[PDB]
Write a protein that binds this ligand. Structure first.
Ligand SMILES: Cc1nc[nH]c1-c1ccnc(Nc2ccc(N3CCOCC3)cc2)c1
Ligand SMILES: CCCCCCCCCCCC[N+](C)(C)CCCS(=O)(=O)O
Ligand SMILES: [Cl-]
Length: 344
């Protein structure tokens, strides 16, 4: 038998014998005896509960294989313990083992070298995805991982374009045009980056709330009521609720992100506080027509210190299935497509 089973964190992992000493991080850490290095193993158990699960799994598999960028998690191995298509049930993804999730990194005291470097790498990864027509729309700290040396990888790719701005849990990083069903462009992801950056400074979620209604209130209370230039791009119906909200001037960026939150008492620190706030003021913009692009954010003085064309300006991923986002299939058909990807 090529496999063995172990209970980890109250789930069954049936894995190739090369993977040893499984530990909870449905994901675990393992030691790979063949490569002599640690790995993360993710079990896809219920990827055929339905078509949404199946599409997500297939898309996750195909994209993780095809994309090769240092800021996007890459696949080391894929396997199934089952021997035939008929018995096929579980899919295991094996990837490089990182040290922490960005959620835990956000909690550390703000350091400009680290924050700028993390943001730079996020921007690099997003740029690469965008070049291949991959616009994430649900970027969040829990799906970004880091190593102890601050190298960063994005864990996921968001939904197919055919999902638009619908996601049918953590909603706090979604852009206004997503929340309000306005349609999106590449810079939808820049809002999420802004939310993450802001949280690195405040150590509090910027726009929390039990639902979108609550979240929209937190947006307008802090950034102000959006302009008629924005209101006019809304459908009439949605606009009524948004127009009938209490008017807010919004707080200035110096009040949202006061000097008190930033390292003090050097001219370098004073400079960086100002630059960090400036970049925030350009990312946390409600109207996506007025919000900074990824490419312009990489030129911003806060970020551009890291800029290396050899990292930033890689060729785009060419995608083999041109209808990856659009085509729909039965469960039986998705299951076979996935199975083929797993067996190659
Ligand atoms: C595929 C996948 N899905 C979610 N996460 C991952 C993943 C992928 C690769 N590496 C890691 N490394 C990692 C290791 C330890 C931690 N923690 C530290 C302390 O306890 C809280 C978390 C976080 C991440 C995680
Ligand atoms: C806090 C209030 C929440 C209001 C929820 C608003 C409901 C939005 C539904 C209208 C859809 C309009 N179109 C343009 C057809 C969507 C394009 C596709 S997509 O935007 O990319 O999904
Ligand atoms: Cl093995």
């Amino acid at each position: 038998n090529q496999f063995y089973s172990v209970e980890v964190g109250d789930s069954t992992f049936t894995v190739l014998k090369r993977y040893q000493n499984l530990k909870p991080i449905i994901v675990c850490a393992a030691y790979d005896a063949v490569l002599d290095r640690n790995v993360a193993i993710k079990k896809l158990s219920r990827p055929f509960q339905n078509q949404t699960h199946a599409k997500r799994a297939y898309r996750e598999l195909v994209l993780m294989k095809c994309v090769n960028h240092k800021n996007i998690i890459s696949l080391l191995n894929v396997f199934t313990p089952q021997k035939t298509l008929e018995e096929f049930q579980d899919v295991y993804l094996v990837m490089e083992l990182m040290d922490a999730n960005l959620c835990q990194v956000i909690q550390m005291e703000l350091d400009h070298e680290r924050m700028s470097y993390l943001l730079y790498q996020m921007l690099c990864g997003i740029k690469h995805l965008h070049s291949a027509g991959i616009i994430h729309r649900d970027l969040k700290p829990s799906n970004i991982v880091v190593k102890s040396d601050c190298t960063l990888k994005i864990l996921d790719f968001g939904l197919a374009r055919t999902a638009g701005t619908s996601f049918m849990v953590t909603r706090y990083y979604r852009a206004p045009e997503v929340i309000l069903g306005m349609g999106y462009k590449e810079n939808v992801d820049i809002w999420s980056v802004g939310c993450i950056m802001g949280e690195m400074v405040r150590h509090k979620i910027l726009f929390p709330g039990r639902d979108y209604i609550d979240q929209w209130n937190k947006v307008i209370e802090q950034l102000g009521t959006p302009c008629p230039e924005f209101m006019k791009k809304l459908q009439p119906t949605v606009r009524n609720y948004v127009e009938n909200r209490p008017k807010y001037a919004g707080l200035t960026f110096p009040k949202l992100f006061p000097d008190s939150l930033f390292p003090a008492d050097s001219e370098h620190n004073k400079l960086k506080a100002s630059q960090a706030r400036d970049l925030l003021s350009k990312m946390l913009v409600i109207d996506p027509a007025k919000r900074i692009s990824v490419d312009d954010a990489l030129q911003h003085p806060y970020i551009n210190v890291w800029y290396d064309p050899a990292e930033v300006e890689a060729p785009p991923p060419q995608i083999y299935d041109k209808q990856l986002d659009e085509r729909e299939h039965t469960i039986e058909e998705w299951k076979e497509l996935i199975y083929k990807e797993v067996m190659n």
